[PDB]
Structures are given as C-alpha cells and as structure tokens.
Amino acid sequence: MSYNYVVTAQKPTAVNGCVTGHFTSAEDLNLLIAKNTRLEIYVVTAEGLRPVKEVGMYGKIAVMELFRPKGESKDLLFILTAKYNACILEYKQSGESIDIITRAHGNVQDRIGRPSETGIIGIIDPECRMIGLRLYDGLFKVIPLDRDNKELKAFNIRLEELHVIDVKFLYGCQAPTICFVYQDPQGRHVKTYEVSLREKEFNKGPWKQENVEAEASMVIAVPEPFGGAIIIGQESITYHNGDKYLAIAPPIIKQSTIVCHNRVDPNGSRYLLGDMEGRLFMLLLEKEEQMDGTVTLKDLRVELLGETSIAECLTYLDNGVVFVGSRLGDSQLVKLNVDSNEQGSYVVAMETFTNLGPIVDMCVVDLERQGQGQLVTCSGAFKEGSLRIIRNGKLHIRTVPLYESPRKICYQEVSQCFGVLSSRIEVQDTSGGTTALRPSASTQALSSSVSSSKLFSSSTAPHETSFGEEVEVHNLLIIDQHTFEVLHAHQFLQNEYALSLVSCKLGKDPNTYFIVGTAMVYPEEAEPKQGRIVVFQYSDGKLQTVAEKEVKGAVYSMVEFNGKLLASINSTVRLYEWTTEKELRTECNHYNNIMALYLKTKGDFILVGDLMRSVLLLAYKPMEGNFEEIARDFNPNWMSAVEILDDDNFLGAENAFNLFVCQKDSAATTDEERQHLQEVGLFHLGEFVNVFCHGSLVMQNLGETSTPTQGSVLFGTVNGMIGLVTSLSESWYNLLLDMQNRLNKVIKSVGKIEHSFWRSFHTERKTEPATGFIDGDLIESFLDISRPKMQEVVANLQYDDGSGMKREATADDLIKVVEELTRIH
C-alpha cells in the first residue's frame, strides 16, 4: 500500500579500488577505477587521463585485478560483488561501440558461513593457474583457471589459521604458492602453503613460518628476480625469501600506519606507501649480485616523498605520475620530481578530482534564490574534511575546506550563518596537554570561546590520562553563509564529544539558539554515564551559554517539537519544555528502547529508530502530557538512519545496505495487532545511508498537479552518493514495475547479475526479493539504449496516457515518461 521510488541524484564519488594494466589493448596503458557500483576505464596519456568508458555494475565492487591467461593478447578483468557475484570480463572495441563482454560468471556464495572481519580479499596468481579468495574465516576458496571453468566453480581448502589478515600469491614459484599473515594467542606470524590443484589441498610451502612484529598487517608479493615477500607492520618492515631474512625499524614511519602499497618498478626496486595521515613514502630495494646470476636484496630504506590525500589506493602511471585514489578526500593526479622543493617535498599536484563522501549530515537551504534549493553536506574526514555546496546548473559544486572532521550541520537564518560540529586529532606535547598536527577551522577562527562550563566540575571524579594517549578535540563552529569564513569556534569540555546539533526556537522565547547534545567519553566505560545538552545564543560575534542540562548518557539525537525539545539519551526518549527561566525541564519520558539513535518528527507524532529494535512509533498525546506507544516494527533491523514519509509510512536504512518501509496494519482487528508495524517495502540499496532529509534540488513547478511522484527526501552516503526517495500511486508503481521487468529482459548486465538478485533484501539472517521500491536508475537507463531496443522494451505494453483508457505504448510515450522522471532530481 506504500509504493515508493528511489533514484540516484549523484553517483558515488569515492574510489574503493584502482588498477592499471593492458585491458583495452596490449599497447594501451589503462586505468580502471571502482567507485562502489561504478567502473570507469581510462587510457593513460603523457598529460593525464582520457575517459573512454563508464559502466555501472549490479553490485558493490570488492575485488578488481587484471590478469592475462596463456594464449590471450591482453588483460582480462576479474570482478567480485559484495553479494559474491564473480565474473571475468574482457574489453571489446570496434568503432565507437564499446562493449564489456562477459567471459565468465558465477555466484561463489557458500550455503553457510560467517563473513570475515577484514572482509573479502581476492587475489590472482601471476601465472593465472588459479584465483584465490579469502571470503570466510577458516576457509580458502580456490577457483581453478581452467579454460572450461566459465561458471567459476570453486573448492574450499581448510585453513588451520582461522583469522587471516592478508594473503598474497608469490612470484617465482614453480607451484602456486600463497603467503599470509595470521593471528593466534601466541601472536602474529607469517606462513606459506603451496596449493595443489592436483590434490585439491595445501602442501607445505617452500619456506618455513616466521615470527613477525606484533602489528604486522600487510603482505606484498615481490616480483622476480627477488621473489619472496615483504611484510609491512606499524613499526617495522621485513623481507623474507627462503634462507633470506631482513628487517628494518625506521622510526619515521612509526607516527602513522602504512595502509596501502603499489609497485613502481617491474623488478620490485621501488614501491609507494601511503599512510592514514596522507604521507607518501618510497620504499627502495637495493640489489646484490651473486655468481649464479640471481639477484638478492642487499638492504632496505624508506624515504619520505611528501604528502597526498589520505590514500585508499595508489597507482603509478608513467613519467613520475601517480593516481591517488581517495575515499576520505579528493582524488588526485600528482607529479613526482627528481629534486625536492624548498620545503623538501618531491611531490607536486597536477590535478584534483572531487569526492563528496562520506556525507555525515546535510541540509537543504535556498542560499541564492527563493525556491532554488541547494544541498549543504558535511563531507570528508581529518585534513581532507570539508563542506560541500551543491546546486544545479550538470551540477555546480563549491568546496569549503575545513581540514578537520565535520559531524553535523544546521542553518540559522536569523544569524545568516551555519553551525557545524567538528572534531580534530591532537597528540601529546612535550610538557602539558595535547597539540594539533596542522591548522584547521577550529584553530583559525577570528575569535574563539573555550567551554568554561562548571555544570558538574564539582563532585565529578576526574579520570586520569596515560602519558602517550592521543585525544580528539570537538568544537562547534559558526561559519558565515555568504563568505564561508570561520567566524567562531567553541571548544567543548575535555573528554566531551559533541554528537548532535540543531538550530531552532523554543517555547515562547523569540531568540534562536544553537543546541548541542554531547557524551562524556572515558576509555574503560562500556556506555557513557555522563553528557550534556547545551543551549547557546549567538550574538555579538560569540556564543554565550544560555542554559545547560546534565544527563546520565549520550545525547545521540535532538529535534525541535512544537516549541519543545525532544531528545534521545542512551536508552531513553525524553521531552523537555523550555521554561520562562531559560532552563530545560523534563516533561515526559519513554523507556522501552535499547538505544534511540535517530529521530524525525511530524506534528505530535514521534518516530523513534533504535540501533537494534529497529523502529517504534509513538504519539505524544498533548491532551495527556505523556507519550503513548502506538506501534512497533517487531522485525529486527540494525538501523543507520530513519525518516517519516507521512503519518502512516516510515522509511528505514540499515547497516547491511538495505532499505525498508513500514506501515500500520490496516487489516488489524485488535489493539495488540494494531501495535505491530508491517514491513511493506524492502530494497537492497547497496549503500550505507547515514541521513535522510526532506527537500529537493529541482526547480519547483508551483502548481504541478498530475505528476508521477509526490514528495522529495534526499539522502547522503559514505561513498558520496546522493539519492532521492519520492512517493508513487499504485498505478504508477505497477507501470514502473512492468517497465523494470522489461528492462531487465533487455539490459546486458555486467557479470550477468539479475537485477532482482541485486536488489533483494539481504542480511546474515534472511534473504528476500525487493518489494515496494522502483529502481529509478533502471527506469532512466531506458534513455541510453538505442531506439530499436526501446521499441523492443515497449512491445505489447498497456499504458494509460493522461486520463483515459489503456492502449499500446510506443517508445515515444515511455521516452516522455522517463524524461519527465529525470527532472525530479
């Protein structure tokens, strides 16, 4: 009875993986880039990047590696999805036609199994004897690369080592051989096995297990002539090859964990390394000759090259050029020079590419023109952190760098400014407290005001701090809406994390306040026992504290409610009145939740989304001054965000990348039955939704009755994807679903994945087909196929044009429908 339409407004921009190779031709150097569901293929030139093809896949790309079987003239591509769809693809070009051919495809799901902690890892041996996949703890899946294995049939080999951190195939082995790091109660170790396809089993590896550093975390497979393996840890770098053992402990790398690597020289003589602070190092292998003509490793050195965006992945191109693929900040093309600059860096940036993800919060404001909505997102992390301002006219994006992590955003029209909660990392100083690693918004304000709050300074046992502990400093920033200058930064109390932010009026008081919900964070506490709601007033260029409320929990969420304050505090939902004396006073409480993380409201009704009990519907009863439990969704879902579609329809998103829609049970004949919400909509989105918000970026057609959709709620994701949810009538739902089925019969799926499988609701507890949701991306894909394919799609299709009787649809009818649909976002 609830029918909804979901469509992508901005595709994900974060890069999850990148590889280079010879995919489009043996002579071409290609770059392939994965942005979750999207695969982009470029040709690498002397000046930069030439786009050649962009495709979507029906899956979250988890592994992407190029390989070239015997007898093939160019690289093939292996892709694995999050739902375990595996495929081998080959690039075929003729004229202006670009096709992704499916050479092989199959589903590699096991009937049972627990996905591993460090996730799916997939690697292909350099001689293409087999593909190896670490999908589940305690199991190693092997796909033999036989010419006949077009279905990617696999077998499992037991792994004695139940907790694998990383694994690689080694180079220079006469039998396929894996090398991996694992953890047990005795510590971490590195071990090898040969993989016998003949025996379908492991055999003893060519070199014995070795002990490694306690935090050894990555394996690099070094090519010939060295062979062997490099093990990267937090404090050390070691090389192993047979009777060869070499370790270094350069102190410079200890400040930040190396998290990615990429080979620079074909012989392994140089590697790039990137750390969590965006520092970029070169690792250089110096050779030693031997009488028998083999080459061995003589020594290892690390050299700091400079700074990049915090890199998820790196690929060296040519001529000193590196592609830096980032998920937390902008991606880049950078140039490496032989000589350093004045500040000692060898790296020079050539080009920067926008990444909007993660979207941690957002709001819609009419910044420039009435009726012209613009989206303002909290984007990024640490030094890459930013605000992003998105407006149409495809899209114009203004970037405001903050150099620290944003968390929440609100708009305050009366002050012509934004409030933004942010956090920065500091490390211990020589003699005192902590010091920041770089300037950021909260340290570069025109003026600043420390939190001198003494709400509970008395009678509060202070908790010690160990010398060496790093600290997070949280701030509320006030930022001008016109200049985007940082007008003010307010620092919160020590160990106090600011979690939620709203701008609103309360009660009968005409002033507008900034209200912040916090938690006091101590390392040994399983859940916070202390927090604050703080009401600030912004006047005369500073925030003055107007009121505080101390609570015994984390204030996860707050929302303005009819001039009152609704707040969620650990396992309680509480309604506060704003008194004549400018204090918060409890009006009423509701207790039957585990953890109320997300609130949205409409009228006197309250929708509470729980971490684990997923959603509950309460009504505040103004004639009783208390809460009433109306209904609950008794199906468990692990929530990440919630939204009220209308008084009767509740939208949820959960951590396994599914959406669902709940309604009251219309066919309920008892109060108890009326208390059960029914999950009437289900859809695998494939993104982790952090936030829904009502609004739209499309020009409003004031008086546009008779359109296919009603309402507009945007949502933001970790990957920088922005989507839109809107409501549909039953007849539109039925028409669009018919269109979906017909599109699914005509569209060539990369890897031959069925749309119904992709969109099917999927958690470790249950798998079910999607219901109640139209895939706007699928509908829009009608517009990029050829006219004859369009004519195929609409053959023998009954369609009601305008108001009247149903008749046969032509391609132009559905072209018009879909074109109209493209303007809703």
Next chain:
Amino acid sequence: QILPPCRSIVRTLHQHKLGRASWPSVQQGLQQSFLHTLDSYRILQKAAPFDRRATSLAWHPTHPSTVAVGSKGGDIMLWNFGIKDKPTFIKGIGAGGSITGLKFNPLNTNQFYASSMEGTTRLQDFKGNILRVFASSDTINIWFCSLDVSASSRMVVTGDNVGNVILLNMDGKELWNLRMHKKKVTHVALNPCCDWFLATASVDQTVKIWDLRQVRGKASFLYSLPHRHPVNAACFSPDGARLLTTDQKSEIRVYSASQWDCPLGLIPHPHRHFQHLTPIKAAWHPRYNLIVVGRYPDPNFKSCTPYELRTIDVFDGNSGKMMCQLYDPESSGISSLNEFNPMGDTLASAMGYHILIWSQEEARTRK
C-alpha cells in the same frame, strides 16, 4: 566477578558512518554493549507456576512478550505479558502424556505443533481443538521425543525413542521413517538458511548430519560426529554456520561449516543429566555469536571458578570462555530450559514447576 567491558563505543558508530571500520567489529562492540545492559537483567521481572513439571518451551516468533510452554503431563500454557487477561490453559491426561517437543506454527500463530509421550505428533489449537495428527506409534510403550519445523521448506521432522526419524510435509506426504540411530533421539533441527540438510542427536553418543533430499539408503549419511557421552541437544545457529552441541556428562562443543568432523572449541560446563529433571538444552542467541546455558553443579566437575552456584551462564561462541552470569534467590531451582527472545530484549527460563521472565527494569518516575 569479571564483567569488565571497555571500548570507544560511539566512535565506532561514527567510524561505521565513515566506512573505515568493518561491520563485524561493529557487531562485536554492540555485542559487548548488549552484555553490559544484560548486567541489568538481574532484577527478575515475573514468575509463573502451574501443575506437573516443565518439559518444552517455545517463543512466539513475531511477538516479544508472548511465550508457549509444555509440561510433563501434556499440560500446555500460553502466556503474554502486559495483558493481564489470565493466560490460556489446556490440560491433558496428566500421567503419561508428556509433551516433549514444541514449536510454533509459522502460518497460524493460534496453532501449534506438539510431540507427546502419548504417541501423537499433533497440530492443535490453544483452545483445545485438535486440528490434525501427523504421525502415530499405533502401539503404546513406543513414543516420540523430538520435533522441529521449517517454514522456508514447509517441513516437519520428529524423532523417536528407538532410533528412527519421521519427516512430513505440512499437508502429510510422508516419505521417510528409515532408521537413523540405535536409541532415543533427544533433539533434532533443520537449518534456517538452508532447507535440505538436517541435524539429529541421540542417546547413542553420536550426532548425525543428514541431507534430507539426497540420502535415502539407511545411513548413507553426510556426516557423523562422535562424542564421549550421550547428547541432549544439537542446535543450529541463526546464521547457519555454527552448530552447537551439548552432552549429558560435562561438555559443550562448537562445530563449524568448516570441516564438520573436527570441532573448533570445547566449552566445559556442568549440566549433568538426571532422570526426573528436565533435560538440558543449550541455545543460541538469535542475533549475536553468544551462547546461553543453565548450570547444574557437580562436585566432581573440574571447576575453573572457585564459586559454583546454580545460575544462568552466558559464554562467547567463537572464543570458548565465559562472559556473564545471572542469579537470583527465591529461584533456587535449576533452569533446565533457557531461551532468549527472537526480538532480543527478553529471556524466558523454564525450571521445574516454574517459568521465569528476566527483562530489564527502568521507569524510575512516572509523569
């Protein structure tokens, strides 16, 4: 006692909002949070008695506060909380008609399956009407002991006191009754994520994994796991990848997807079998990797703890060691059966002649 927990909780949630930290680490942190709040279940909420001993327990799948229970004398009870409508009852012969297997009907919640000492695997309403019998001994002194059901497959399975198992459809259609064991079948269960391999346990000190569609040849089984003593329960995970097993003398075993033969860990814990006591059944928690069992002290069991009380113990699955213990005087019986809610906010315990409800307290002050 131990219960130490620590972590940077909210950080991880925001880390999950950034994509940095993986979901299983989140599941672990919130598992710890669940343990921390389970430390406040100490205040026992409700108690409920009736006549002859408790033998079987079951949860209303959709509803948290509803529960069904079956006695040693075929006396069934259905009870809901926050209702106060004087719960529903049905009596039986009272002497030799012990209900011993009890699962709800996935279709009609006002129905229920049952396995009885009378020799009658039946489908019956809580108002008394027998809807349909599924099988029968047709000869007294030969009766059933085990029962389970699956909705995705629409199948029923039940086990005997001699060593043969029966498998029916929801509408009859019996293609089964081959012999599997030499002695009584104590417990049996189907996979929830699969539909066509089964698990059965017996007094024969062996627990067997079958493939109900492939095998038809009288112990042409798929796997057979041995034990040192007879087995009272072998229960599947919700996820489907972990099989938990609990014997009669002193042991619990975790078998994996990965090489069913070999076990991943042994959890020693005292649940010593006894004649007039209801047999003990360890159980999973539906949404974490925890294990929950009732304790029965033995002066001969090699106790790691120096304090051995009768209490509800809660262990971690993929490690082997313990994480929590619930205890309450005025309830000094031995919790034979214990089952958490499918919802995840409530626990039911079946002791001899008593049923206990353990949920959290709060509501400091009404307004």
